[PDB]
Amino acid sequence: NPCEKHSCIAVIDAGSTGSRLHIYSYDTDDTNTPIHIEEIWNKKIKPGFASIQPNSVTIDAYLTMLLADAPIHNIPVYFYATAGMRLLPQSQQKKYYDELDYWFRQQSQWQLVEAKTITGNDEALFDWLAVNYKLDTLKKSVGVMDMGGASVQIVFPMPKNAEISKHNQVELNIYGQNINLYVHSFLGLGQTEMSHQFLNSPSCFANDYPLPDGESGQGNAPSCKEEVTSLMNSVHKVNQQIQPLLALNPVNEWYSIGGISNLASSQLFHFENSELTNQSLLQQGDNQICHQQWDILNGQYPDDEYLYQYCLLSSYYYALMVDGYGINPNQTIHYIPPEDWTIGVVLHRAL
Amino acid sequence: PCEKHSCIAVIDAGSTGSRLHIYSYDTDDTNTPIHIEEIWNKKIKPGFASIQPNSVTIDAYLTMLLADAPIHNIPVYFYATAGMRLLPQSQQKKYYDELDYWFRQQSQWQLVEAKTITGNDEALFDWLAVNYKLDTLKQNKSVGVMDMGGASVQIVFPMPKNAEISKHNQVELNIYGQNINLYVHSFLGLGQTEMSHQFLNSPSCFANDYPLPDGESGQGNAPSCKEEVTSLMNSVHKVNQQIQPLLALNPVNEWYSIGGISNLASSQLFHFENSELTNQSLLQQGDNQICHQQWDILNGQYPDDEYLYQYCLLSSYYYALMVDGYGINPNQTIHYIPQNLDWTIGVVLHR
DSSP: OHHHHSEEEEEEEEOSSOEEEEEEEEEEOTTSOEEEEEEEEEEEESSOGGGSOOSHHHHHHHHHHHHTTOSOOSEEEEEEEOHHHHTSOHHHHHHHHHHHHHHHHSOSSEEEEEEEEOOHHHHHHHHHHHHHHHTTOOOOOEEEEEEOSSEEEEEEEOOOOTTSOGGGEEEEEOSSSEEEEEEEEEETOSHHHHHTTSTTOGGGSOBTOBOTTSOBOOOOHHHHHHHHHIIIIIISOHHHHHHHHHHHSOOSEEEEEETHHHHHTSTTOOOSTTEEOHHHHHHHHIIIIITSBHHHHHHHOSSOSSGGGHHHHHHHHHIIIIIIIOOOTTSOEEEOOOOOTTHHHHHHTTO | OTTTSEEEEEEEEOSSOEEEEEEEEEOOTTOOOEEEEEEEEEEESSOGGGSOSSHHHHHHHHHHHHSSOSOOSEEEEEEEOHHHHTSOHHHHHHHHHHHHHHHHTOOSEEEEEEEEOOHHHHHHHHHHHHHHHHTOOOOOSOEEEEEEOSSEEEEEEEOOOOTTSOGGGEEEEEETTEEEEEEEEEEETOSHHHHHTTSTTOGGGSOBTOBOTTSOBOOOOHHHHHHHHHIIIIIITOHHHHHHHHHHHSOOSEEEEEEHHHHHHTSSSOOOSTTEEOHHHHHHHHIIIIITSBHHHHHHHOTTOSSGGGHHHHHHHHHIIIIIITOOOTTSOEEEOOOOOOTTHHHHHHO
16 A cells, blocks of 8 residues: 555545546655655546535535545545636635535545635646656746636746736745746636637638537638637737736746647647647648538547537637747647646645 | 416526426417416526436436426427537537437427527527517517527517528518518627626626635726626627627617516616616616625625625626627616516417
8 A cells, every 4th residue: 555655645626527536645855845746546526516516415425426435545635626616706615615624524534634716826836836846847947838628827937026916926945946936827718618709700610510509610710819819818918918927037848738738639630749839730720620621520520529629729729829928839839638737736735 | 277278388498597487378360379378487407508418317307397397298399598509519419319318208298399599599589578578569669689698698679681691690570460570699608607707807897805716806896897898798709890780770669688687687786667777877886886895895785695796797797788789878778577578488479
């Protein structure tokens, strides 16, 4: 048993499509900081915690399902909900947490540290730490983009300044050294939530795709991008808030976690070495989905669940990274598959 | 009841829940329903598109909706609206195959058809429903209906056939002798719940000190929140460019509105008389009652109101949609329905 020879912790990612429980074993260096972080357990249940009825029966039954069969007991647990939960009013959220609190108090096998909806900024911080641990780069400026179901996050080094809001900035000391980060999160710009604004725009789907209200897809990536861009800059003002900061704090290497990898390593996009550029992404989306005829394209992939959405998503990614953030179309973006960020919680609690 | 009159069931499979309605009616020379009377009403949550797409789950949900009704051997229409439209066809099939199965094992209900209707068909039943209740179908004056939904919004009014406009935005039918032609439009994504997800971190849209999901505080101000909502209206959806020129050519002689507006207008916080409002008075009251009020105080003052937190946002949004979007005079009267009336009576009629 790993946890007889090592420290162990559970982190629950209470995300938008389901909850995923992670259990990690680890050692600690000279400063009681985790090293040799290894995931020893990993179970996901569906749907998201924010999408279940908020009462004792449903919640008790939900947690029981997530946690009954876990191979290690008597370890600290963190339950962290992200953007799906941020969409509910604080008053609705409290109902979920008060029942969850009562469940965890009646059991003797888990030791709950906190159960809460984390802010996207905190989410950003855990993303950055997880990736930098993973790349063995915690001793060049590293940037992280996390593309989620309901929100997206961006994080990268920036010296502290009092002109920029306190919630958008973090300082920490890490394996001996002082790192200041800018954290941002855009609620509503996740792929799932943004997409609900564009389901009727012909330019975002393959030719003759039947759109929800009866019109036909007439796919064109450049055009769909500009539509997505209207939402990013006119509404959320991504460009105005992010671009001038990147202009003063250039990033050396970009890592994207979350949904981009699902698209990138689909049967429909082709990249090598887990790297893309937005130029190639938009061009591939344009030629390989947007200008394809839906009948024929569905004909080759009649059993694939998000193919239909790939003209819009390639267009969205470009809009966000290039028109929002102001990353050069030719700048390499590395990507990690979602199959992670909860490694960031293991790390942050020992600083 | 249904041996003295001929009758039918309609299921409104809405975004937030499903609503079964059983109607008794009679007919006239034109074989059109008259004396339409709702004899049974059952409501359950959540929305159909929101439950787990499996046989056990879909089974129990349907049974809970339908096995209740004190009637035997009745035709039923199952119409799913905007919540289902949010899902790709391949995602919708499992729901409907599970539905076919359920109905096939009983004979209480004779399923006529089960279908995801368009926002345009929705907008047709809306308009039928209002005018049936108003007794204006059996012309002289021009009634329009705006339907304020969870995920989408509908607007509908009379307009003579035009070959420039897509067939999908135009409905033609003969009723009680006279033919009628209607413009129908639906904005998927601009319904109340979906649009809210883009503005949750907007201080201008919330009561002073409301805790925004990101950690900043509400600092209420209606005009300002309204302008923000207006960017989603026009810069993203192009409502003004689509609707205003038409209305200008085909003026509406009276405005009705069903859905979320009625709940708001008839809440404790807003004062309206005679089942009518104006946008100028809505946005002033919103700004006065909510936006410019302290949150804790107002929260403590209305313990039973779980929508209250978004009344600053909702009043600014309704004004953005009706005034900056549609073009309606801030001083113009809008009738709201306060509730023996549902859009599903329009399904009874339309056949």
